[PDB]
Design a protein around this ligand. Structure first.
Ligand SMILES: Nc1ncnc2c1ncn2[C@@H]1O[C@H](COP(=O)(O)OP(=O)(O)O)[C@@H](O)[C@H]1O
Ligand SMILES: Nc1ncnc2c1ncn2[C@@H]1O[C@H](COP(=O)(O)OP(=O)(O)O)[C@@H](O)[C@H]1O
Ligand SMILES: Nc1ncnc2c1ncn2[C@@H]1O[C@H](COP(=O)(O)OP(=O)(O)O)[C@@H](O)[C@H]1O
Lengths: 362, 38, 443, 449, 441, 66, 132
């Protein structure tokens, strides 16, 4: 019986009969799909529909051996703004001629009249005044000022450069005579200084450690990290872009949409930095200490929707081949390794690929 | 053959364990722990 | 093309004499409603002159009397030169933002800022590019480009070499360059080089070489609504929210800054203000909180004209437990003028059915048109227009060339009109689920 | 294999003349409704009219849902059939009129030819080159990657853009891997290790793959089926580029958003260009709103705008209600539970309750479909329940009775097995009598009211 | 611990004739309902039928949950048995419809078969190279059986696992090359003494034998809901456990339904339909019922078992009353199984079973009195007195629960009827439905 | 402390024949200008500015959602 | 546990070819308030010492289930080494130098729910944005 892939092809062929009730070529390609659907249209590495502009190659012969692959991917939705709006002060936050408000307001609201600047905090640092708690939350006036002004991504990178030392104190400062010692400048950091997690990392039988890992252990045990993706998005697009005929707009596109510091954080140190960090006479810290991009949940699909055909599908995509595989895996007890005959030459080549997948000798 | 200038090797077997350090790393900060800093 | 035949596709305009605003008995797809079409013509004059801010007009009439038709006529007679915003009142009930936010945004979409900017643009067929990469690339390069009238070499700066290599420009490509910014758009491929394009499949189209000057000062006219400026200024890529729609409740101090900035641009002559129109269909679906907002949003120099349509009689205002004409509170109806649309006479029904039959591809015998006109009087204009499509499909299945009375009669038998369907539920009352939830499944 | 309520329905069972055969394609009767549903099928296949509405009006169990499923089979798998209940419109993430538009645009299909322009090969060499950023504060950055790709037929060295190198970093590529680089997206896929390294002596289950045949550089032609909703969504929450927004968009929780009409009108223009280029064809389809009485006055008001759209699908509504209160409009009652205003837009196909002999014939079709053998006395007994109680009820007995029969070893269901099924499995009304009779008394053994 | 249904260990029916035994597997009486339930198990186990909604109806107690819990015990581990309380469908994360869709799809299993290779051997040598100040890692593992030795390259992921596991020479380890899990099993010889902090001593093992590799078939069952979650996301598969899944888009589920059919025809997957048990279904509202009408019509619908206590009762979200609190166009799709109140000879048996499960030794007189209390006050109340009387008897160091201990329990703890009387006899001192109360003596 | 690149001076406009660059005339006025500006804010502007990083400080805001 | 009194490699008796040094043991002296001990550690602990930047006089612990170490801080015995240093100084551990004891952990099952549904320790950008 035909596989579902064969069945779909065979159906699309009998749709042609609606014109005709070329039949010789039709019956010949009916014979092809009944041999294997890869004789008709071979399965290949595939991806969602891409809804975007790109620069395609016009000539293969003139391309040569050395070529630069620029990043041409661009949205077809193409939002066009005059530079009066997008560049020349129609954006309120960006200072310039014809935006005299923005430069003033930037300085005064973020520095002068900003409660988080160290000169302002230091006036309120005492008594029942509003920054009185700062003495005990394990952060400096400089760090308080940084956390108020950097965004949650930038703060998260800075948080990579930190150590769970209050959790280590729980391991060490343990006896009654240690009196649960805590740095007084970290006094209010209560839940960090005491929680079960740090202790469970250290015990010789990881009972409380395992109990906290159940969800991720179960996930991997089910093989859901390795199972084939049963669905994907049918279309995919790059972000919409402003089209504005200014050089500043082009510069700004690179600064935001291809943001260097975010990218550097995600992908980590460069090879020269690893050398300079490693051969120096003294240690040196790196902007991110490591690549901060997460590990992908799917071990094979990772961060892309590209899918690659497999030999498992190849066998099952022809009903004959699936049936033949079942009987060959017992005729192996008799031999007859090449007692096979074909009406089509390319079918013999496909059978070499199948046999080599089975590692069956000719 | 010469080892990778940047990689320190640990190896363990029935006799126990050793670490071996490229001479390109002695005289760096990485050598200090092995008693062979700048 | 993509645009299929919809209910209103036959409406091309208002059908009104531009000199006198006298409506013609039929033109541009609108039949009858002459007093209503005259009033809608007076409103277009107000919209196009821009002088008056925040008038609200209500189109009041029974169902299927051309209230939307007249609204489509106005949109078509303003054309693309004016912001026209079409709001179903059901849309204001966002979960992303409050109702009044959604009403502010709708008002702000309906005022345009018109801005004129020149660019030099260079357009022609590429005769040659050479690039020397040494080996880091982009060290130097030369572009030869032509029109039918001129040819030139350009020495290229290194970032133009990056633009060229990014867009894979090759000999024969017809390109345009916005040289104030250096984006390349590949307008096409020259036919004269078709053999060079060895990788392009046979479906590939080819252009003729451009013509005239290689460089032109093209002038572009942009219209951007006040809402777009607001959303741009809301976050680092706020303009993306004009598409994904996840604008929060944009803070009102942002809008007030923008209102000041735009008045500055008007006095400097850097920009022109283009007041549009907001159309609110089924305005009776707004609630009492919306109406009290709209009251005061109208009283502003940056208010569009608003146009509203209602089918409702004396009906309960939403968000309250009392009834008012059109379903709208009298506090609001005080600031509104009403245009009323009447039912059609049979000769108007005949014409509307004819126009609908010519917009669709339907050859209709005179007796079928007479029969459909009788059905229109008795079942309503919408039902008869729906029967046109049906009868065509029935005629086609029996291979007939014209829709005959025979085909209309199949349609009338197969598809019930509203009144026949009401009788059906009354006779089938025990078998249908009543308002008490009771039903009997037995024979 | 698994058998559901509608597994016997195969189509409308019409002649080429468009007349219903009295029993065909799984149907019995409904002939006038099947003929009207035939004309709806032909309206859809004509792909010429936008925004026409159809109401299937009729009591519960009269085959309204069967007919809608038959339309879907007459149309076949090329055309979008988008079935929903009115209860599905009430998203917590987005406004109810948003899920109306999403479902309207799922009902419009597009077939498009796509050129994948791609590079393939075994990675023979790979070498980064760096920028000395002086004062960015992020340190150095890689300025390009040079990579050597080898296929069976030829070889290239590619100087990749940094954003394409980031794609290779995400894909964990190493020398000797076989990779795929789609220049459309700038995405990179690692296909495997080259078969030249095929060895058992690696702890990880590597994909050893043969060297790519043909040229390193290829163009692939692919025909894709998408809906307008897939394009809308792709462009609302972009994930296809190698820019930072696309990258982080793959890490954040998926989230529906109130896609604006600006995006929809922009995507119409995009699709119109694919049509004018000849790479696409429009396949407008049908949205089936089952349980349409569960919509509300805001939904119906929105359909009055939405159905005016010049690319709106065909909308089939089913309702089972007599004169009923419109939801969200508690003062307004109308037939079908549909506002009088919106009812004027629809063509109403009434469906009618079955005769005793039609019910008997449905019992046989359904028995054949579940694969169960009945005596004629059994078929008559079941048909009696279809008349006296309900069609749905009598069809539910076939599966219980088959088990009860098999339990006695008889392979054919006879009257004793239906007689037992009647007593094990009550209908709604026998159960309602138990409620009322016991409800004479409260205390411990009363039903809770 | 002992719970309300811990004694229920099956449905208590003859597997051949489906005849309910009067007592078996902890179930007593209800024979018609237990026979009807035994037939529904056959529909489930055969799997061919999709979307049959069965309503267990009856007054409170009478074992509606007990029968449904007996079925769960009869299906065993492989079949899904999702239990919903209808109150779980109301959510702030997702619509009711989405909450129902997820629960329906939780009830369909997908039994994937995969083949894996595991290594096992004695580690003879381990070598790891580490970059200074960087992530770059490589290594080699020399591993042995009594009959093979080979040197395997290790990637970075293996080296992380190897050091997490502290793999050392002489350890017996196994490695699943598919998952990459490493497990230690013991040591071929003592832990070497020269180094300190060498960790806890392991088991001894003799060296593994035969080939290093072997193939092993492994079977995993996942619901269609898990597949939905995994495929709606690039990242965040923690949502499978955390909730937080959002409203998954329907075009994703369409794709999954096709692929699962394709996986079935390929022989990659076996679909395993189970049941959704909805308890107290009268808590659903009119929109939920309208969704369920058509969710049942899919060929991927599970069999849905429902329980209700309600008489003619108001439907939620609705003005009007209906039997069971369920709407009639919903009940048209539903067969009803009726449970009945128990005979005193049945109460005595049920109480005896509870006493055995709770390990309580009733005297025959205590059982007689508890049976009489069971008639007057209900089975649940009398079952609570069993545990209480056990405690009271123990405090006086009695060997057995006597009538005196049951009488004292009855004295201490009010019957739900006596409490209603107590409420009536103090209407002024309890707070009324209109909030008035008097605190003065 | 604000600054803006207006463009490249068009005295350099013929460095190349094509470059992706925006050539502008040299400013014809005085190179230094002193202006009295009366600036208005509100207490709410101060609230907003102190509650959260604003504008170009908060680039990740471009992702929307949370 | 202790302050690190000493760190001292031992060369191996069979050094590897082509390598400048081969280390067979890494001695660490640990001092607590109650004793002094020479830990003859496995050489692989060099990794933690470099990454944790362990100095003589820093307070550390070494856990036997991993063999790694963690730095608690610099001992306050050195708080006068400089007029200005960016160190928090921490007391010397007041336990034994070797702490082996049973520990009793009390958790609710809700704590296990949250510890699984909201894992706390994640090193990636999304975890770190999460916890902020
Ligand atoms: N005067 C008219 N001329 C032409 N077409 C009309 C006229 N009035 C109504 N129609 C058409 O008849 C249908 C019903 O009228 P419409 O304006 O939609 O109803 P309503 O007034 O309820 O909004 C529409 O397709 C509309 O285009
Ligand atoms: N004419 C018919 N022929 C065969 N089966 C039918 C027919 N009409 C209804 N049925 C079947 O009877 C049941 C009830 O029909 P259904 O369409 O669900 O009613 P409703 O109008 O409530 O949707 C379904 O199993 C359906 O397949
Ligand atoms: N027939 C029975 N056999 C054994 N135990 C029963 C029986 N009926 C009820 N029980 C037990 O008594 C208690 C009440 O029954 P339950 O099933 O909870 O009633 P409901 O129908 O209200 O859910 C449960 O602990 C149950 O185990």
């Amino acid at each position: 019986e035909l596989s579902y892939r064969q069945r779909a092809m065979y159906q699309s062929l009998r749709n042609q009969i609606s014109i005709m009730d070329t039949l010789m070529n039709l019956v010949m390609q009916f014979r092809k799909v009944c041999n294997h659907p890869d004789l008709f249209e071979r399965a290949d590495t595939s991806s969602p529909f891409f809804c975007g502009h790109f620069a395609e190659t016009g000539s293969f012969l003139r391309e040569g051996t050395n070529v630069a692959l620029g990043y041409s991917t661009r949205s077809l939705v193409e939002y066009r703004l005059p530079r009066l709006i997008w560049c020349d002060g129609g954006r309120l936050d960006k200072p310039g001629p014809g935006n005299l408000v923005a430069g003033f307001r930037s300085k005064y609201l973020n520095h002068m009249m900003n409660i988080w600047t160290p000169e302002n905090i230091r006036s309120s640092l005492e008594g029942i005044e509003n920054f009185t708690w700062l003495r005990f939350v394990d952060t400096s006036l400089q760090e308080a000022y940084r956390a108020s002004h950097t965004d949650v991504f930038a703060r998260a990178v800075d948080l990579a450069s930190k150590q769970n030392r209050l959790g280590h104190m729980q391991i060490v400062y343990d006896e009654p005579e240690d009196k649960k010692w805590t740095p007084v400048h970290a006094l209010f950091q209560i839940c960090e200084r005491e929680n079960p997690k740090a202790v469970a990392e250290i015990t010789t039988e990881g009972v409380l450690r395992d109990l906290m890992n159940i969800a991720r252990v179960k996930y991997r045990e089910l093989g859901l990290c390795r199972l084939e993706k049963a669905a994907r998005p049918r279309a995919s697009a790059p972000p919409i872009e402003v089209v504005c005929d200014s050089r500043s707009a082009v510069i700004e596109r690179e600064n935001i949409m291809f943001h260097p510091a975010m990218r550097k954080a995600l992908f980590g140190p460069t090879p020269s930095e690893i050398k300079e960090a490693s051969f120096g006479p003294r240690p040196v810290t790196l902007y991110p200490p490591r690549a901060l991009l997460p590990a992908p949940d799917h071990d094979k699909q990772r961060f892309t929707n590209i899918t690659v055909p497999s030999m498992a599908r190849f066998v099952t995509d022809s009903g004959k081949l699936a049936k033949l595989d079942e009987l060959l895996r017992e005729l192996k007890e008799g031999g007859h390794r090449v007692l096979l005959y074909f009406q089509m030459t390319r079918m013999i080549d496909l059978m070499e690929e199948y046999l080599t997948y089975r590692n069956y000798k000719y | 053959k010469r080892p990778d200038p940047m990689m320190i090797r640990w190896v363990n077997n029935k006799m126990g364990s050793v670490v071996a350090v490229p001479e390109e790393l002695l005289g760096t900060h990485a050598g200090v722990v092995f008693g062979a800093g700048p | 093309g993509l645009n299929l035949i919809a209910a209103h596709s036959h409406i091309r305009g208002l059908g009104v004499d531009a000199d006198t605003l006298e409506p013609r008995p039929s033109s541009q797809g609108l039949v009858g409603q002459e007093k209503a079409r005259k009033a809608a013509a007076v409103v277009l004059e107000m919209i196009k002159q821009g002088k008056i801010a925040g008038r609200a007009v209500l189109i009041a009439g029974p169902p299927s009397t051309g209230k939307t038709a007249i609204a489509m006529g106005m949109a078509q007679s303003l054309g693309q030169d004016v912001p026209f915003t079409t709001l179903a009142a059901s849309e204001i009930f966002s979960l992303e933002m409050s109702k009044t936010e959604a009403l502010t945004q709708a008002f702000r979409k309906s005022i345009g800022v018109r801005i004129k900017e020149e660019s030099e643009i260079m357009e022609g067929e590429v005769v040659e590019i050479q690039i020397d990469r040494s080996t880091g690339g982009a060290k130097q390069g030369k572009l030869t480009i032509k029109t039918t009238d001129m040819e030139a070499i350009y020495d290229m700066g290194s970032k133009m070499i990056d633009a060229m290599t990014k867009e894979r420009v090759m000999a024969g490509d017809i390109i345009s360059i916005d040289k104030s910014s250096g984006k390349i758009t590949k307008l096409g491929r020259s036919y004269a080089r078709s053999r060079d394009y060895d990788a392009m499949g046979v479906d590939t189209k080819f252009l003729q070489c451009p013509e005239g000057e290689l460089q032109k000062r093209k002038e572009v006219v942009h219209t951007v609504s006040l809402h777009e400026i607001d959303v741009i200024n809301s976050r680092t890529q706020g303009f993306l929210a004009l598409f994904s729609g996840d604008t929060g409740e944009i803070r009102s101090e942002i809008r007030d800054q923008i209102n000041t900035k735009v008045a500055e641009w008007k006095e400097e002559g850097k920009a022109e203000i283009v007041p549009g129109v907001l159309f609110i269909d089924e305005v009776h679906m707004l609630d009492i909180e919306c109406f009290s907002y709209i009251n005061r949003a109208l009283e502003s120099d940056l208010a569009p004209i608003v146009i509203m349509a209602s089918n409702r009689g004396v009906s309960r205002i939403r968000g309250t437990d009392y009834k008012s004409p059109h379903g709208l509170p009298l506090d609001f109806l005080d600031r509104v003028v009403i245009i009323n649309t009447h039912p059609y006479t049979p000769d108007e029904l005949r014409q509307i059915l004819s126009i609908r039959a010519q917009e669709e591809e339907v050859d209709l015998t005179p007796d079928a048109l007479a029969l459909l006109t009788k059905i229109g009087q008795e079942a309503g204009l919408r039902y008869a227009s729906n029967l046109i499509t049906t009868s065509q499909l029935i005629a086609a299945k029996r291979r007939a060339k014209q829709v005959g009375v025979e085909d209309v009669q199949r349609s009338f038998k197969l598809f019930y009109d509203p009144a026949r369907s009401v009788r059906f539920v009354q006779e089938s009352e025990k078998r249908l689920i009543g308002n008490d939830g009771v039903v009997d499944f037995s024979y | 294999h698994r058998t559901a309520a509608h597994t016997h329905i195969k189509g409308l069972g019409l002649n080429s003349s468009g007349i219903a055969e009295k029993q065909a394609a799984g149907f019995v009767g409904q002939c006038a409704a099947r003929e009207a549903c035939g004309v709806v099928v032909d309206l859809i296949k004509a792909h010429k009219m936008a925004g026409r509405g159809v109401l299937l009006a009729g009591g519960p169990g009269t085959g309204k849902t069967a007919l809608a499923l038959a339309i879907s089979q007459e149309l076949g798998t090329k055309i979008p059939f988008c079935p929903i209940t009115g209860s599905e419109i009430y998203s917590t993430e987005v406004k109810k009129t948003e899920v109306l538009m999403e479902n309207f645009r799922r009902a419009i299909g597009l077939r498009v030819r796509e050129t994948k322009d791609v590079y393939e090969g075994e990675v023979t060499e790979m070498t980064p080159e760096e920028a000395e950023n002086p004062l960015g504060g992020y340190g150095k950055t890689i300025s390009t990657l040079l990579i050597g790709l080898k296929s069976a037929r030829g070889q290239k060295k590619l100087r990749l853009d940094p954003s394409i190198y980031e794609a290779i970093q995400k894909e964990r590529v190493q020398v000797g891997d076989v990779i795929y680089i789609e220049t459309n997206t700038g995405a990179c896929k690692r296909v495997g290790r080259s078969d030249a390294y095929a060895t058992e002596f690696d702890l990880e289950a590597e994909e050893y793959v043969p060297i790519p045949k043909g040229e390193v550089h290829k163009k692939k032609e692919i025909v894709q089926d998408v809906t307008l909703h897939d394009l809308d969504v792709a462009n609302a929450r972009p994930q296809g580029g190698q820019d930072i927004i696309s990258m982080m968009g793959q890490l954040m929780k998926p989230k529906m958003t109130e896609i604006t009409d600006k995006l929809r009108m922009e995507i119409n223009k995009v699709v119109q260009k694919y049509i004018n280029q000849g790479v696409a064809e429009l396949i407008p389809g049908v949205l089936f709103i089952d349980e349409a009485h569960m919509l509300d006055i805001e939904c119906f008001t929105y359909l009055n705008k939405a159905l005016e759209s010049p690319i709106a699908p065909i909308v089939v509504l089913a309702s089972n209600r007599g004169i009923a209160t419109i939801r969200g409009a508690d003062d307004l009652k109308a037939a079908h539970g549909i506002p009088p205003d919106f009812l004027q837009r629809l063509l109403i196909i009434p469906t009618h309750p079955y005769e005793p002999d039609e019910i008997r014939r449905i019992v046989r079709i359904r028995a054949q479909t579940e694969g169960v053998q009945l005596t004629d006395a059994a078929v008559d007994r079941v048909a009696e329940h279809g008349v006296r109680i309900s069609l749905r009820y009598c069809l539910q007995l076939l599966a219980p009775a088959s088990i009860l029969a098999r339990v006695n070893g008889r392979t054919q269901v006879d009257v004793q097995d239906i007689a037992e099924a009647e007593e094990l499995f009550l209908d709604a009304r026998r159960s309602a009598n138990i409620l009322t009779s016991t409800g004479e008394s409260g205390g411990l053994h009363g039903f809770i009211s």
